[PDB]
Nucleic acid binder design. Sequence first.
RNA 1: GGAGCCAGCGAGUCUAACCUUGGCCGAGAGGUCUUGGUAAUCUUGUGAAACUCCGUCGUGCUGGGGAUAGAGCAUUGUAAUUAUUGCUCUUCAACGAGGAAUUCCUAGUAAGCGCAAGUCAUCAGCUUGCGUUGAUUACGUCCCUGCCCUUUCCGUCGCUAGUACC
Lengths: 57, 36, 219
Amino acid sequence: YRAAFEDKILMSDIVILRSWYPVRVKKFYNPVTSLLLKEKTEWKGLRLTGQIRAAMN
Amino acid sequence: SQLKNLKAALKARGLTGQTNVKSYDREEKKKAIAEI
Amino acid sequence: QVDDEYAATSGIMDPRIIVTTSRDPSTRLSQFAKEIKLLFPNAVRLNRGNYVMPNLVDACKKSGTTDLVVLHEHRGVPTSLTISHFPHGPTAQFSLHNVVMRHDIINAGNQSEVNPHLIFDNFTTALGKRVVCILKHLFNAGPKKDSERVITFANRGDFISVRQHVYVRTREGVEIAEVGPRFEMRLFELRLGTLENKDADVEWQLRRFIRTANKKDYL
RNA sequence: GGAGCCAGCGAGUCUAACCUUGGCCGAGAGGUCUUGGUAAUCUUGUGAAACUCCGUCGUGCUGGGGAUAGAGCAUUGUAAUUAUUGCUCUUCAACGAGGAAUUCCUAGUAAGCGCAAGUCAUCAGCUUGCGUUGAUUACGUCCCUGCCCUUUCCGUCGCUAGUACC
Ligand SMILES: [Mg+2]
Ligand SMILES: [Mg+2]
Ligand SMILES: [Mg+2]
Ligand SMILES: [Mg+2]
């Protein structure tokens, strides 16, 4: 495509187009139910990204 | 030309002339305007 | 107030205009020139085959012409309109958008060429008044009160809409019929000198890469 | 196919790699070694084209037409066997002057021919500018059409004042 600029550009330069992409909120709901568990103190839900990566190495 | 056609159309609908020379529902007249 | 360049002859000497086109004009551009001649009462169309800008302006200045109109196109689509005022400018350049020629209308008929009434609207800024003064002086002065022809330049967001209408005074209202053409002309450059003088100082120019251009108004 | 052969407007490299002469290599495209120019100084006389002379061809969709397609030789990036822009060969179509209609045009004008810059709008085989060759016909009329100007000429009903009438 053809483009016009306020001033002459050099071949080494890099042109960029700014744009915005919509993002959505994840509908995840995990209530804590410690009282229903035998131990009542080791409830575990979705793990952190770091923890997951460490587990899979 | 355009002016001659325009004047003739108005005269046909009685838009031009006199009120005093001696030789309709206002909504209906509005319909006549829109057609012109 | 009328500009200094025009103040000397403002309302004194009837404007003399030459309408022309670029080299090797297309048929549509040649057509497009024709109504511009018909638009201005005192315009004469001149075939520009091989004429030279120093030669053209010098010959025109000798003949006593007031303004020179040159037209540019792109595949038979009118694109630009430049008006240069003699003997020493100013030169105003415009871009034509959504151009609608009268040849596009079937059974259109012939124009009336009386001295037309002029309508300029929404011109408030100082630059706007300059545009009014430049355009205002292309036409003949003192139109007849019963002159049946009206030319309107309506400024809407820096885009000057141009229309040509003929009216009739009826008992309860006035009914206007447009004769054409329709085109929107935007000022994008203005110089203090003839179109030939490429080095003439630029009084004003349109900045398009400034960040506020998308919302900026000038006229 | 050879030979002759002539313009103008412009553009062009600093904390860079632009216009590029000349030499060599390459069928070409292009490659390579140098060189002048920040430019009325070098590219550049931009040795442009059309155009002229001598030759081949010969009324045959033919040596007109070059659409479509195949195979190769190179440039550009980039790491793909990706595209990109050039050249070589082959392939060789519709098209034999174009209905009804329709648009424009009066002198360096219609028309043909190339060169340069893409310098805030628009433009990318498109815009603008520059230059070369250069015509036929008309330059008279309101007869038809259309648009105006003048009667600071003639009719109808008006409006103002008055007189009476039904
Ligand atoms: Mg031509
Ligand atoms: Mg052109
Ligand atoms: Mg050309
Ligand atoms: Mg004549």
